[PDB]
Nucleic acid binder design. Structure first.
Length: 132
RNA sequence: GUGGCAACACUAUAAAUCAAAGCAAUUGGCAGCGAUAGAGAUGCGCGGUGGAAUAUGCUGUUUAAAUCGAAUUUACGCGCAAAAUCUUACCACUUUUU
């Protein structure tokens, strides 16, 4: 049950991301959770985040040469939240609204098995299956 | 000189020079020869540079002097942890003592 706190805390620490208060990113990510509630019931939040991250687990990693490597699932979480967040900055700098909305809409879409995180994610899944 | 169908196969010395040409175990430098260990050593991340302006140092140009050294790594926020005169050694001018 504590893995909820683990994934959320890794989300926080990766949301820190430039030198600053993790209070600033922490209120930012909690604002993303509440904005996820607002957009989700607009047109049921830890639920959709846990589903989104468990949708996003890269189980076997690959190393270039191309060689697959087995992966301890905590780094699967850790890559996972990483790919989510660089896709988030892609979408938000393209929108240049806040980041909280962007991480919210991305956690919804990666819950819905859609978005560039899911694209990158399952291509490296299949490419791990390719080069055995 | 002997053999042959021959390519040439022999047998066979020297003239002339040199002061070493060599040999074996090493001890070190190589590896475009492997096994074991160690370094963000990478491919793993973050933030820079190089884009703009300012600061700052250096070359080069000129000026009377832009005092003098530092020069590829390890020089270039270096001697200077500080130049408005003085620091200051360089120049223009006016004097001074050997």
């Amino acid at each position: 049950x504590x893995x909820x706190x683990x994934x959320x805390x890794x989300x926080x620490x990766x949301x820190x991301x430039x030198x600053x208060x993790x209070x600033x990113x922490x209120x930012x990510x909690x604002x993303x959770x509440x904005x996820x509630x607002x957009x989700x019931x607009x047109x049921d939040v830890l639920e959709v985040l846990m589903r989104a991250v468990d949708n996003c687990k890269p189980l076997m990693k690959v190393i270039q040469s191309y060689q697959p490597r087995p992966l301890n699932p905590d780094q699967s979480t850790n890559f996972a939240v990483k790919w989510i967040l660089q896709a988030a900055q892609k979408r938000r700098a393209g929108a240049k609204a806040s980041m909280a909305e962007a991480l919210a809409v991305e956690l919804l879409l990666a819950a819905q098995r859609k978005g560039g995180a899911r694209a990158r994610r399952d291509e490296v899944h299949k490419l791990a299956l390719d080069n055995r």
